[PDB]
Short mmCIF file of N, CA and C in Angstrom, two decimals:
data_model
loop_
_atom_site.label_atom_id
_atom_site.label_comp_id
_atom_site.label_asym_id
_atom_site.label_seq_id
_atom_site.Cartn_x
_atom_site.Cartn_y
_atom_site.Cartn_z
N UNK A 1033 61.14 108.42 104.81
CA UNK A 1033 61.78 109.52 103.68
C UNK A 1033 63.72 109.85 103.29
N UNK A 1034 63.57 109.75 102.43
CA UNK A 1034 64.67 108.78 100.90
C UNK A 1034 64.55 110.97 100.47
N UNK A 1035 66.20 110.99 101.32
CA UNK A 1035 66.77 112.52 100.55
C UNK A 1035 66.63 112.40 99.49
N UNK A 1036 66.41 114.11 98.82
CA UNK A 1036 67.44 114.30 97.61
C UNK A 1036 68.25 114.20 96.79
N UNK A 1037 69.17 114.57 95.52
CA UNK A 1037 69.66 114.80 95.23
C UNK A 1037 70.32 116.30 94.85
N UNK A 1038 69.41 117.02 95.42
CA UNK A 1038 69.44 118.84 95.85
C UNK A 1038 70.59 118.75 97.32
N UNK A 1039 69.90 117.68 98.27
CA UNK A 1039 70.21 118.22 99.51
C UNK A 1039 71.40 117.35 99.00
N UNK A 1040 72.32 116.58 98.25
CA UNK A 1040 73.57 116.09 99.25
C UNK A 1040 74.22 116.59 97.90
N UNK A 1041 75.49 117.35 98.53
CA UNK A 1041 76.24 118.03 97.20
C UNK A 1041 78.07 117.62 97.51
N UNK A 1042 78.53 118.04 96.70
CA UNK A 1042 80.16 117.30 96.23
C UNK A 1042 80.80 117.93 95.57
N UNK A 1043 82.11 118.27 95.75
CA UNK A 1043 83.13 119.41 94.75
C UNK A 1043 84.79 118.91 94.70
N UNK A 1044 85.14 119.57 93.81
CA UNK A 1044 86.92 119.13 94.76
C UNK A 1044 87.58 120.86 95.15
N UNK A 1045 88.26 120.15 95.86
CA UNK A 1045 89.52 121.47 96.66
C UNK A 1045 90.77 122.39 96.31
N UNK A 1046 91.26 120.59 96.39
CA UNK A 1046 92.63 120.18 95.40
C UNK A 1046 92.91 119.55 94.99
N UNK A 1047 93.70 119.96 93.77
CA UNK A 1047 93.91 119.29 92.44
C UNK A 1047 94.65 117.73 92.87
N UNK A 1048 95.99 117.77 93.57
CA UNK A 1048 96.78 116.42 94.25
C UNK A 1048 97.68 117.19 94.95
N UNK A 1049 97.59 116.29 96.27
CA UNK A 1049 98.88 116.94 97.13
C UNK A 1049 99.64 115.90 97.36
N UNK A 1050 101.12 116.43 97.99
CA UNK A 1050 102.26 115.82 98.11
C UNK A 1050 102.58 115.67 99.54
N UNK A 1051 102.90 114.21 100.05
CA UNK A 1051 103.43 113.85 101.15
C UNK A 1051 104.86 112.71 101.30
N UNK A 1052 105.08 114.00 101.99
CA UNK A 1052 106.75 114.05 101.99
C UNK A 1052 106.93 114.35 103.40
N UNK A 1053 109.13 114.63 103.81
CA UNK A 1053 109.66 114.45 104.91
C UNK A 1053 109.68 116.00 104.77
N UNK A 1054 109.99 116.43 106.33
CA UNK A 1054 110.91 117.76 105.77
C UNK A 1054 112.13 117.44 105.79
N UNK A 1055 112.97 116.04 105.92
CA UNK A 1055 114.91 115.63 105.92
C UNK A 1055 114.74 115.76 104.21
N UNK A 1056 114.06 115.61 103.75
CA UNK A 1056 113.78 115.78 102.27
C UNK A 1056 112.28 117.33 101.17
N UNK A 1057 112.15 117.66 101.91
CA UNK A 1057 111.39 118.75 101.70
C UNK A 1057 112.02 119.47 100.82
N UNK A 1058 112.89 119.64 100.64
CA UNK A 1058 114.33 120.69 100.28
C UNK A 1058 113.09 119.72 99.01
N UNK A 1059 114.61 119.30 98.65
CA UNK A 1059 114.28 118.27 97.37
C UNK A 1059 113.19 118.08 96.89
N UNK A 1060 111.70 117.84 97.51
CA UNK A 1060 110.50 118.47 96.97
C UNK A 1060 109.81 119.41 96.37
N UNK A 1061 110.44 120.00 97.05
CA UNK A 1061 109.70 121.65 96.84
C UNK A 1061 111.18 122.48 96.36
N UNK A 1062 111.80 122.25 95.41
CA UNK A 1062 112.78 122.69 94.86
C UNK A 1062 112.96 121.13 93.56
N UNK A 1063 111.42 120.12 93.00
CA UNK A 1063 112.23 119.42 92.60
C UNK A 1063 110.58 119.39 92.10
N UNK A 1064 109.79 118.59 93.16
CA UNK A 1064 107.78 118.74 92.69
C UNK A 1064 107.50 120.31 92.43
N UNK A 1065 107.82 120.93 93.50
CA UNK A 1065 106.95 122.00 93.24
C UNK A 1065 107.07 122.56 91.98
N UNK A 1066 108.56 122.66 91.41
CA UNK A 1066 108.18 123.38 90.26
C UNK A 1066 107.89 122.58 89.14
N UNK A 1067 108.39 121.03 89.55
CA UNK A 1067 107.18 119.49 88.93
C UNK A 1067 105.64 120.32 88.14
N UNK A 1068 105.59 120.62 89.75
CA UNK A 1068 103.88 120.36 89.49
C UNK A 1068 103.63 122.03 89.20
N UNK A 1069 104.07 122.98 89.51
CA UNK A 1069 102.93 124.14 89.99
C UNK A 1069 103.17 124.40 88.32
N UNK A 1070 104.18 124.11 87.48
CA UNK A 1070 104.20 124.07 86.53
C UNK A 1070 103.51 124.30 85.30
N UNK A 1071 102.58 123.47 85.69
CA UNK A 1071 101.03 122.86 84.91
C UNK A 1071 99.91 124.21 85.85
N UNK A 1072 99.68 124.42 86.40
CA UNK A 1072 98.89 125.58 87.95
C UNK A 1072 98.48 124.90 88.18
N UNK A 1073 98.60 123.60 88.84
CA UNK A 1073 97.46 122.56 89.26
C UNK A 1073 97.54 122.80 90.70
N UNK A 1074 96.59 123.35 91.26
CA UNK A 1074 96.66 123.74 92.70
C UNK A 1074 97.08 121.93 93.98
N UNK A 1075 98.11 122.70 93.98
CA UNK A 1075 99.21 121.63 95.42
C UNK A 1075 98.71 121.30 96.38
N UNK A 1076 98.42 120.37 96.72
CA UNK A 1076 98.03 120.71 98.31
C UNK A 1076 99.44 120.34 98.81
N UNK A 1077 100.41 121.08 99.64
CA UNK A 1077 101.46 120.79 100.78
C UNK A 1077 101.75 120.42 102.05
N UNK A 1078 102.38 120.75 102.68
CA UNK A 1078 102.59 120.76 104.03
C UNK A 1078 102.34 122.33 104.16
N UNK A 1079 101.77 122.75 105.22
CA UNK A 1079 101.35 124.31 105.45
C UNK A 1079 101.28 124.80 107.49
N UNK A 1080 102.58 125.87 107.63
CA UNK A 1080 101.88 126.17 109.33
C UNK A 1080 100.42 126.11 109.67
N UNK A 1081 100.33 126.02 110.81
CA UNK A 1081 98.84 126.88 111.77
C UNK A 1081 97.78 125.09 111.03
N UNK A 1082 98.46 124.08 111.92
CA UNK A 1082 97.75 123.25 111.84
C UNK A 1082 95.78 123.26 112.43
N UNK A 1083 94.88 122.71 111.74
CA UNK A 1083 93.78 122.53 112.23
C UNK A 1083 93.62 121.44 113.80
N UNK A 1084 94.25 122.50 114.53
CA UNK A 1084 93.47 122.35 115.80
C UNK A 1084 92.90 121.43 116.32
N UNK A 1085 92.05 120.64 116.54
CA UNK A 1085 91.07 118.66 117.54
C UNK A 1085 91.14 118.54 115.90
N UNK A 1086 91.64 118.02 115.09
CA UNK A 1086 91.42 118.06 113.95
C UNK A 1086 92.66 116.11 113.82
N UNK A 1087 92.69 114.49 114.07
CA UNK A 1087 93.31 113.78 114.20
C UNK A 1087 93.81 113.80 113.10
N UNK A 1088 94.77 113.47 112.20
CA UNK A 1088 95.93 113.21 111.72
C UNK A 1088 96.11 112.01 110.95
N UNK A 1089 95.90 111.19 111.23
CA UNK A 1089 95.50 109.45 110.67
C UNK A 1089 94.20 110.12 110.21
N UNK A 1090 92.82 110.72 109.86
CA UNK A 1090 92.03 110.53 109.42
C UNK A 1090 92.43 111.81 107.82
N UNK A 1091 93.36 112.30 107.77
CA UNK A 1091 93.99 113.49 106.93
C UNK A 1091 94.80 112.58 106.01
N UNK A 1092 95.04 111.42 106.19
CA UNK A 1092 96.42 110.94 105.61
C UNK A 1092 95.05 110.71 104.03
N UNK A 1093 93.49 110.23 104.92
CA UNK A 1093 92.91 109.32 103.87
C UNK A 1093 91.47 110.19 103.21
N UNK A 1094 91.46 112.10 103.78
CA UNK A 1094 90.85 113.20 103.55
C UNK A 1094 92.35 113.46 102.50
N UNK A 1095 93.14 113.51 102.53
CA UNK A 1095 93.03 114.75 101.80
C UNK A 1095 93.46 113.68 99.99
N UNK A 1096 92.54 112.41 100.01
CA UNK A 1096 92.14 111.55 99.09
C UNK A 1096 91.08 112.25 98.42
N UNK A 1097 90.44 112.36 98.96
CA UNK A 1097 88.69 112.38 99.12
C UNK A 1097 88.77 114.41 98.41
N UNK A 1098 89.73 115.03 99.66
CA UNK A 1098 88.87 116.85 99.54
C UNK A 1098 90.42 116.85 97.68
N UNK A 1099 91.26 116.02 97.44
CA UNK A 1099 92.15 115.85 96.11
C UNK A 1099 91.45 115.42 95.72
N UNK A 1100 92.63 114.81 94.42
CA UNK A 1100 91.98 114.76 93.21
C UNK A 1100 92.94 114.19 93.27
N UNK A 1101 93.95 114.09 92.88
CA UNK A 1101 94.97 113.16 92.82
C UNK A 1101 96.07 112.80 94.48
N UNK A 1102 96.79 111.89 94.11
CA UNK A 1102 97.58 110.91 95.98
C UNK A 1102 98.99 111.55 95.77
N UNK A 1103 99.75 112.12 96.27
CA UNK A 1103 101.20 112.25 95.33
C UNK A 1103 101.76 111.55 97.23
N UNK A 1104 102.65 110.00 96.90
CA UNK A 1104 103.56 110.36 98.26
C UNK A 1104 104.67 109.54 97.60
N UNK A 1105 105.89 110.52 98.33
CA UNK A 1105 107.76 109.84 97.60
C UNK A 1105 107.74 108.65 98.69
N UNK A 1106 108.83 107.78 98.54
CA UNK A 1106 109.10 106.58 98.47
C UNK A 1106 110.63 106.79 99.24
N UNK A 1107 109.98 107.67 100.82
CA UNK A 1107 112.29 107.57 101.15
C UNK A 1107 111.99 107.42 102.09
N UNK A 1108 113.39 106.96 102.99
CA UNK A 1108 113.69 105.71 104.05
C UNK A 1108 114.02 106.78 105.71
N UNK A 1109 113.81 108.00 105.55
CA UNK A 1109 113.68 109.26 106.51
C UNK A 1109 111.91 109.42 106.74
N UNK A 1110 111.04 108.84 105.64
CA UNK A 1110 109.43 108.32 106.29
C UNK A 1110 109.58 107.61 107.03
N UNK A 1111 110.01 106.61 106.84
CA UNK A 1111 109.85 104.88 107.63
C UNK A 1111 111.59 104.91 109.47
N UNK A 1112 111.73 106.11 108.51
CA UNK A 1112 112.70 105.94 109.44
C UNK A 1112 112.18 107.10 110.77
N UNK A 1113 112.09 108.17 110.05
CA UNK A 1113 111.51 109.54 111.07
C UNK A 1113 109.73 108.96 111.25
N UNK A 1114 109.41 109.01 110.35
CA UNK A 1114 107.80 109.36 110.31
C UNK A 1114 107.39 107.87 110.06
N UNK A 1115 107.81 106.37 111.41
CA UNK A 1115 108.13 105.52 111.21
C UNK A 1115 105.97 104.97 111.85
N UNK A 1116 105.34 106.29 112.83
CA UNK A 1116 104.84 106.36 113.33
C UNK A 1116 103.64 107.40 113.44
N UNK A 1117 103.99 107.98 112.34
CA UNK A 1117 102.92 109.11 111.44
C UNK A 1117 102.72 108.54 110.09
N UNK A 1118 103.33 107.16 109.85
CA UNK A 1118 103.06 106.68 108.55
C UNK A 1118 102.87 105.38 108.75
N UNK A 1119 103.01 104.76 110.12
CA UNK A 1119 102.19 103.49 110.50
C UNK A 1119 100.41 103.66 110.45
N UNK A 1120 99.61 105.16 110.64
CA UNK A 1120 98.27 105.17 110.98
C UNK A 1120 97.96 104.34 109.78
N UNK A 1121 98.84 104.49 108.75
CA UNK A 1121 98.37 104.62 107.21
C UNK A 1121 98.54 103.09 107.09
N UNK A 1122 98.33 102.32 108.03
CA UNK A 1122 98.36 100.95 107.63
C UNK A 1122 96.79 100.14 108.14
N UNK A 1123 96.48 100.83 109.28
CA UNK A 1123 94.85 100.62 109.25
C UNK A 1123 94.03 100.74 107.88
N UNK A 1124 94.12 102.12 107.16
CA UNK A 1124 93.60 102.46 106.29
C UNK A 1124 93.70 102.14 104.98
N UNK A 1125 92.11 101.27 103.65
CA UNK A 1125 93.23 100.37 103.21
C UNK A 1125 92.35 101.17 101.80
N UNK A 1126 90.84 101.64 102.56
CA UNK A 1126 89.91 101.99 101.49
C UNK A 1126 90.71 103.04 100.61
N UNK A 1127 91.89 103.51 101.69
CA UNK A 1127 92.30 105.17 100.88
C UNK A 1127 92.72 104.61 99.10
N UNK A 1128 93.03 103.34 98.77
CA UNK A 1128 93.08 103.98 97.18
C UNK A 1128 93.03 102.06 96.63
N UNK A 1129 92.89 102.33 95.63
CA UNK A 1129 93.23 100.88 95.27
C UNK A 1129 94.78 100.38 94.17
N UNK A 1130 94.43 99.69 94.19
CA UNK A 1130 95.95 99.23 93.09
C UNK A 1130 95.77 99.60 92.30
N UNK A 1131 94.31 99.88 90.60
CA UNK A 1131 94.03 99.58 89.66
C UNK A 1131 93.91 101.12 89.78
N UNK A 1132 94.76 102.31 90.38
CA UNK A 1132 94.07 104.18 90.79
C UNK A 1132 95.41 104.70 89.39
N UNK A 1133 94.78 105.55 89.14
CA UNK A 1133 94.96 106.22 87.84
C UNK A 1133 94.84 108.09 88.96
N UNK A 1134 95.77 107.64 89.58
CA UNK A 1134 95.34 109.16 90.80
C UNK A 1134 96.51 109.38 91.86
N UNK A 1135 97.25 108.65 91.58
CA UNK A 1135 98.22 107.99 92.42
C UNK A 1135 99.73 108.44 91.64
N UNK A 1136 101.15 109.09 91.93
CA UNK A 1136 101.99 109.09 91.82
C UNK A 1136 103.13 108.71 93.30
N UNK A 1137 103.88 107.74 92.26
CA UNK A 1137 105.21 106.45 92.94
C UNK A 1137 106.00 107.79 92.79
N UNK A 1138 107.13 108.33 93.61
CA UNK A 1138 107.94 109.38 93.51
C UNK A 1138 109.45 108.28 94.04
N UNK A 1139 110.47 107.84 94.13
CA UNK A 1139 110.70 106.24 95.20
C UNK A 1139 112.44 108.19 95.15
N UNK A 1140 112.51 108.57 96.36
CA UNK A 1140 113.36 109.12 96.23
C UNK A 1140 114.62 109.09 96.12
N UNK A 1141 114.88 107.53 97.78
CA UNK A 1141 115.43 107.40 98.05
C UNK A 1141 115.28 105.33 98.34
N UNK A 1142 116.37 104.95 98.04
CA UNK A 1142 115.81 103.36 98.40
C UNK A 1142 115.67 102.92 99.75
N UNK A 1143 115.21 101.83 100.27
CA UNK A 1143 114.65 101.80 101.54
C UNK A 1143 114.96 100.07 101.63
N UNK A 1144 115.54 99.90 103.58
CA UNK A 1144 116.19 98.84 103.50
C UNK A 1144 114.87 97.70 103.61
N UNK A 1145 114.54 96.53 102.33
CA UNK A 1145 113.93 95.48 103.08
C UNK A 1145 113.45 94.65 104.35
N UNK A 1146 115.08 94.71 104.77
CA UNK A 1146 114.74 93.63 105.41
C UNK A 1146 115.15 94.65 106.95
N UNK A 1147 115.18 95.13 107.34
CA UNK A 1147 114.61 96.39 108.34
C UNK A 1147 112.68 96.25 108.22
N UNK A 1148 112.86 95.91 107.23
CA UNK A 1148 110.54 95.93 107.16
C UNK A 1148 110.56 94.91 108.14
N UNK A 1149 109.57 95.62 108.96
CA UNK A 1149 108.69 94.87 110.11
C UNK A 1149 107.81 93.89 109.88
N UNK A 1150 108.16 92.57 110.16
CA UNK A 1150 105.91 91.91 109.01
C UNK A 1150 104.75 92.67 109.42
N UNK A 1151 104.89 93.47 110.57
CA UNK A 1151 103.53 93.40 110.65
C UNK A 1151 103.76 95.15 109.66
N UNK A 1152 104.67 95.39 109.43
CA UNK A 1152 104.28 96.48 108.28
C UNK A 1152 103.56 95.97 107.10
N UNK A 1153 102.77 96.13 106.33
CA UNK A 1153 102.27 95.61 105.86
C UNK A 1153 101.82 96.80 104.53
N UNK A 1154 101.80 98.03 105.11
CA UNK A 1154 101.73 98.46 104.24
C UNK A 1154 102.86 98.91 102.98
N UNK A 1155 104.11 99.39 104.11
CA UNK A 1155 105.58 99.12 103.49
C UNK A 1155 105.85 97.95 103.06
N UNK A 1156 106.25 97.05 103.63
CA UNK A 1156 106.33 95.48 103.06
C UNK A 1156 105.85 95.92 101.82
N UNK A 1157 104.06 95.92 101.50
CA UNK A 1157 103.12 96.22 100.38
C UNK A 1157 103.86 97.11 99.03
N UNK A 1158 104.88 97.39 99.14
CA UNK A 1158 105.59 98.35 98.26
C UNK A 1158 106.80 97.31 96.79
N UNK A 1159 107.26 95.86 97.35
CA UNK A 1159 107.66 94.54 97.11
C UNK A 1159 106.92 94.93 95.84
N UNK A 1160 104.86 94.57 95.47
CA UNK A 1160 104.43 94.95 94.39
C UNK A 1160 104.53 95.99 93.46
N UNK A 1161 104.53 97.05 94.03
CA UNK A 1161 104.26 98.46 93.68
C UNK A 1161 105.76 98.89 93.92
N UNK A 1162 106.97 98.32 93.78
CA UNK A 1162 107.90 98.99 93.22
C UNK A 1162 108.63 99.14 91.40
N UNK A 1163 107.69 98.81 90.66
CA UNK A 1163 107.08 99.85 89.85
C UNK A 1163 107.08 100.68 89.42
N UNK A 1164 107.08 101.56 90.74
CA UNK A 1164 107.49 102.91 90.70
C UNK A 1164 108.43 104.26 90.17
N UNK A 1165 108.66 105.08 90.49
CA UNK A 1165 108.75 106.62 89.50
C UNK A 1165 110.61 105.88 90.68
N UNK A 1166 111.73 106.47 90.28
CA UNK A 1166 113.13 106.47 90.83
C UNK A 1166 114.37 107.91 90.36
N UNK A 1167 114.59 108.79 91.66
CA UNK A 1167 115.47 109.71 91.15
C UNK A 1167 117.12 110.02 91.09
N UNK A 1168 117.12 110.14 89.23
CA UNK A 1168 118.61 109.68 89.04
C UNK A 1168 119.14 110.34 90.26
N UNK A 1169 120.49 110.17 89.93
CA UNK A 1169 121.70 110.28 90.39
C UNK A 1169 121.82 112.23 89.09
N UNK A 1170 122.23 111.43 88.58
CA UNK A 1170 122.77 112.39 87.23
C UNK A 1170 122.13 113.37 86.31
N UNK A 1171 121.91 114.34 86.45
CA UNK A 1171 121.23 116.03 86.31
C UNK A 1171 120.27 115.42 85.17
N UNK A 1172 121.12 114.82 83.87
CA UNK A 1172 120.64 114.81 82.26
C UNK A 1172 119.56 113.38 82.14
N UNK A 1173 119.60 113.17 83.45
CA UNK A 1173 118.33 112.01 84.09
C UNK A 1173 117.44 112.40 83.95
N UNK A 1174 117.33 113.51 85.01
CA UNK A 1174 116.16 114.15 85.83
C UNK A 1174 115.70 114.42 84.23
N UNK A 1175 115.19 114.86 83.40
CA UNK A 1175 114.50 114.33 82.36
C UNK A 1175 114.01 113.65 82.47
N UNK A 1176 114.42 112.47 82.25
CA UNK A 1176 114.10 110.57 82.19
C UNK A 1176 113.11 110.52 83.05
N UNK A 1177 113.41 111.49 84.30
CA UNK A 1177 112.11 110.83 85.50
C UNK A 1177 111.14 111.24 85.25
N UNK A 1178 110.45 113.08 85.20
CA UNK A 1178 109.23 113.22 85.08
C UNK A 1178 108.47 112.55 83.54
N UNK A 1179 109.74 112.52 82.81
CA UNK A 1179 109.02 112.13 81.28
C UNK A 1179 108.39 110.87 82.02
N UNK A 1180 108.85 109.79 82.32
CA UNK A 1180 108.18 108.45 83.28
C UNK A 1180 107.12 108.40 84.19
N UNK A 1181 107.15 109.68 84.89
CA UNK A 1181 106.50 110.09 86.31
C UNK A 1181 104.93 110.20 85.47
N UNK A 1182 104.39 110.86 84.20
CA UNK A 1182 103.91 111.17 82.92
C UNK A 1182 102.95 110.04 82.61
N UNK A 1183 104.06 109.72 81.48
CA UNK A 1183 104.15 108.31 80.94
C UNK A 1183 102.78 107.24 81.82
N UNK A 1184 103.78 107.45 83.11
CA UNK A 1184 102.52 106.08 83.90
C UNK A 1184 101.67 106.23 84.58
N UNK A 1185 101.16 107.74 84.52
CA UNK A 1185 100.72 108.60 84.93
C UNK A 1185 98.68 106.79 83.29
N UNK A 1186 99.50 108.23 81.95
CA UNK A 1186 98.36 107.54 80.42
C UNK A 1186 98.95 105.72 80.84
N UNK A 1187 98.98 105.31 81.73
CA UNK A 1187 98.71 103.65 81.68
C UNK A 1187 98.27 103.03 82.87
N UNK A 1188 97.08 102.75 82.50
CA UNK A 1188 96.26 101.49 83.47
C UNK A 1188 96.52 100.67 83.89
N UNK A 1189 96.90 99.83 85.54
CA UNK A 1189 97.23 98.88 85.57
C UNK A 1189 96.43 98.09 84.92
N UNK A 1190 96.69 96.27 85.38
CA UNK A 1190 96.04 95.72 84.80
C UNK A 1190 95.98 94.60 86.28
N UNK A 1191 94.94 94.14 86.43
CA UNK A 1191 94.46 93.54 87.48
C UNK A 1191 93.49 92.80 87.88
N UNK A 1192 93.29 91.82 87.83
CA UNK A 1192 91.97 90.73 87.79
C UNK A 1192 91.73 89.83 89.16
N UNK A 1193 91.40 89.69 89.48
CA UNK A 1193 91.19 88.24 90.53
C UNK A 1193 89.60 88.37 90.99
N UNK A 1194 89.37 86.93 91.32
CA UNK A 1194 87.62 86.34 91.31
C UNK A 1194 88.16 85.05 91.98
N UNK A 1195 86.76 84.27 92.32
CA UNK A 1195 87.12 83.41 92.74
C UNK A 1195 85.60 82.94 91.91
#
């Protein structure tokens, strides 16, 4: 017995979600919030009252399934404080590809590579994704950040690997 198409149904719930830490939650809500909300898109951010009896490890990858785009901020407090919560991400690989046009990388703060453990493949992997956005120290440079962020989405990565 083959199930028809009518039986299977799929729909979107959110436009995009951001992944940050409480340490830099203010900046995200004082920069990213006003940066995304400005467009009027459904931004899925952290919110009290978490769903009980639901593993978070899966939510990390699920966020992309329920959302249209995945936004993550590269900060030190993330691996310094949320080294475990993020560690789970490692197990997840299909979460997203390299040539994905629905991901926004924002480097809120620098991160020490020497500290990056060999086991941390997801973190060290950044070495290749170093072509992400960086938060400027000057206020006048802030305009460039958002500018590059958008352009980065307009451009599509180029990767080719076959045997």
